[PDB]
Structures are given as C-alpha cells and as structure tokens.
Amino acid sequence: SRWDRVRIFRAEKSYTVQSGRWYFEFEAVTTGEMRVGWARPELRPDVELGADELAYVFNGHRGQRWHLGSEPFGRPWQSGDVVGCMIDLTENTIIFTLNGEVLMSDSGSETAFREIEIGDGFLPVCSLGPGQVGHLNLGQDVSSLRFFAICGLQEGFEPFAINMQRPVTTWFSKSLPQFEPVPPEHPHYEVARM
C-alpha cells in the first residue's frame, strides 16, 4: 500500500534542541531508499521526509537533499557507509558528511542548508523504505562514533546524547489505521454541527 512503504524514526519531542551544535551518525546497512537528517517536532508521520518544510534530510540512495522538494547533493552511499548529520544552530546551517568527508552540492557550498530558522527546534530523524536496514547512533557512547573525531569534534559539535543515562527514546510512524477527530482546519473536509 501507499503507507506501508516508509517507516519514519525520530527522537522524542522532549529532546528538541534550539541552540548549540549537535552531531549524530547513521549507518546504511542496506543501500536502498533511506533518508536521514533533522526534523521539527511537528513532523507529520504520513508525509515523506523533506517533501514539506518540516524536515531537512539527505537521501543517500541517489544523492539528494530534501526540503520542500528534492535537489541533487553529494553522492549515493554504499553498504556500511556512515552519514554524519551535523546541525549548527549558531550559524543556522546543516552539514552532512559521508565516511568523514563533507558532502557538497554542485558548487562550493560545504553546507546542505543555510539560513534555517530555529523556531520550535529540531530533532534527529530517519526514514527507511521497504526492505531497508539502518543503524542510528545518537552518540550516547562517544567512543562508539566512527567518524566524529575525523569530522565534527574539532568543529565544536557535540554528540546529540553526550551526557544522558538512558538511551534516547525514539518514536516511529506506525502504519496501523486509527480513527481520529476531523481537524477543524482540514483543507478538504469540513464538519458542521446542525
């Protein structure tokens, strides 16, 4: 079906960051359709990551960055490649690295996104397509990160969960249909109480 195709994993809204520089890694066990990046707390579970303004993700299947659309960025990944997602809320930039090498667009731009407004904040997020396996490392154990020292440690970035006891609680988009109240601001459906 249309919905049992992409499964979105994100951190809990209580971990939203509105300042500082943060780093985490995503390992692509498979090479298919997987996206990883940063998302706002109001992220919608039934929308592909980056198809709207609520997520800034990098699609490593074919080397694309997604935010309100797709544009080429970087190179496609391989099995075992580690993607280092870096967000800088002091410069309002997002940087993606592949195996310690910073990905670049079709220009000298070393940053995937620029002039991003903080607003509510950002959360680490990833989406996996059908038959896709990925490893998310939020950096609770700094020694477990494989490319943080190579690119990210000297730039002032910190692991997303550097000082945390319990592992970061994650929420996933469950493809089980449920009945919910019709939103008062639904674009297509209106309910009038007569």
Partner 1 sequence: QPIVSRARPELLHSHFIPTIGRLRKRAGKVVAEEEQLRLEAKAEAEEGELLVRDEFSVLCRDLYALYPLLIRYVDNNRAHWLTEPNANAEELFRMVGEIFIYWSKSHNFKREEQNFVVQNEINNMSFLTADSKSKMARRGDRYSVQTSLIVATLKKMLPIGLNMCAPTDQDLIMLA
Give the footprint of partner 1 on this chain (CB under 8 A).
63, 74-75, 100-101, 103-104, 106-108, 149-151, 154-155
- Between 94 and 151, CB nearer to partner 1: 151
CB of 6 to partner 1, least distance (A): 25
CB of 61 to partner 1, least distance (A): 14
Residue 68's nearest CA partner among 104, 116, 107 is 116
- Between 17 and 104, CB nearer to partner 1: 104
- Between 30 and 99, CB nearer to partner 1: 99
- Between 105 and 175, CB nearer to partner 1: 105
Contact present, 83 and 60 (Cβ < 8 Å): yes
CB of 149 to partner 1, least distance (A): 6
CB of 150 to partner 1, least distance (A): 5
